[PDB]
Write a structure and sequence with these properties.
This is part of a larger assembly, with chains A (61 residues) and B (66 residues). With 61 residues, chain A is mostly helical. Helices cover 75% and strands 0% of the residues of chain A. Chain A is built from 2 helices and no strands. Chain B is mostly helical. Chain B has a single domain, classed as Methane Monooxygenase Hydroxylase, Chain G, domain 1 (Helix non-globular). Chain B is built from 2 helices and no strands. The radius of gyration of chain B is 25 Å and the shape is elongated. The termini of chain B are far apart. The chains are: A mainly alpha (61), B mainly alpha (66). At the A-B interface, helix 1 of A face loops of B. Chain A: This is ATP synthase peripheral stalk subunit d, mitochondrial. Chain A: It is found in: Mitochondrion; Mitochondrion inner membrane. Chain A: It comes from Bos taurus.
């Protein structure tokens, strides 16, 4: 019955570490490439749009 | 363990004599020891030849999708 005890203690006291993070740039190398999207492509894209709609108005006129 | 007293008295008496001995519980006998060692092998095959006095442990990993 010694065995039960020995393995008991070692096992029950033991905690093995959660398979560990290596990468967390995902969030980041995105959210920065999401700015890459926004500011960089937002601005250029919105500024273009304005010229279109600006000529149409007068073209509706 | 126990029934018919007329045989049983003697028969059970001899069985206890076994327990009341420590050159084996009265003896053992080669024949048993040979089979024991065999059977002990086989059941290790039954559940793999690791020793479950210890438990397993694992390892960890990750990769990038894009």
């Amino acid at each position: 019955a010694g065995l039960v005890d020995d393995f008991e203690k070692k096992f029950n006291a033991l905690k093995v570490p959660i398979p560990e993070d290596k990468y967390t740039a995902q969030v980041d190398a995105e959210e920065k490439e999401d700015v890459k999207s926004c500011a960089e492509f937002l601005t250029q894209s919105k500024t273009r749009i304005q010229e279109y709609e600006k000529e149409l108005e007068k073209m509706r006129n | 363990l126990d029934p018919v007293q007329k045989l049983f008295v003697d028969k059970i008496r001899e069985y206890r004599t076994k327990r009341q001995t420590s050159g084996g519980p009265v003896d053992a006998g080669p024949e048993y020891q040979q089979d024991l060692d065999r059977e002990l092998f086989k059941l290790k095959q039954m559940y793999g030849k690791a020793d479950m006095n210890t438990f397993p442990n694992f390892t960890f990993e990750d990769p990038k999708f894009e």
